[PDB]
Amino acid sequence: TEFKAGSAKKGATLFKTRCLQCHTVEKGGPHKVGPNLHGIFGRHSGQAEGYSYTDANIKKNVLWDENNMSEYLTNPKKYIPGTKMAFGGLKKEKDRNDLITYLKKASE
Numbered sequence: 001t002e003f004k005a006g007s008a009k010k011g012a013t014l015f016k017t018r019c020l021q022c023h024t025v026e027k028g029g030p031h032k033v034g035p036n037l038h039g040i041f042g043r044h045s046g047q048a049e050g051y052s053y054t055d056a057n058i059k060k061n062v063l064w065d066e067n068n069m070s071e072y073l074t075n076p077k078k079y080i081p082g083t084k085m086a087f088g089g090l091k092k093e094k095d096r097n098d099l100i101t102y103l104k105k106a107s108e
């Protein structure tokens with residue numbers, strides 16, 4: 001959205017051993033370490049009711065889109081007060097730029 005955009009770079013191989021380790025963009029995703037994302041971006045924070053979420057994320061309504069999301073992906077444990085998301089942060093806008101770039105795809 002605002003980033004320098006990507007180019008279907010190494011995004012797929014990213015999520016795999018980056019988010020997949022926790023999550024599942026798919027629908028069938030029964031949920032593992034984290035809730036399912038799917039075609040996020042546009043909704044208000046978490047979008048899963050069946051699965052028990054956190055009282056921090058849901059309590060944010062951080063309308064996902066592109067930059068925002070990344071804004072959290074980087075520092076999810078700061079922005080979100082009480083994020084069970086044990087990610088830490090990529091701190092590498094480089095990948096981040098590709099993350100969303102591809103994410104949007106994976107999400108769609």
Ligand code: HEC
Nearest residue numbers: 018019022033034035046052053054057058084085086087
């Ligand atoms: C495990 C070490 C994680 C990795 C790697 C990533 N995520 Fe994550 N995410 C994780 C948790 C434990 C949670 C919170 C769930 C809880 O209830 O404990 C999250 C949350 C998300 C969210 C918001 C959903 C929500 O649960 O409220 C998003 C949009 C999200 N995670 C996306 C996502 C992406 C795209 C990642 C790879 C770049 C990723 N996460 C990594 C755990 C883990």
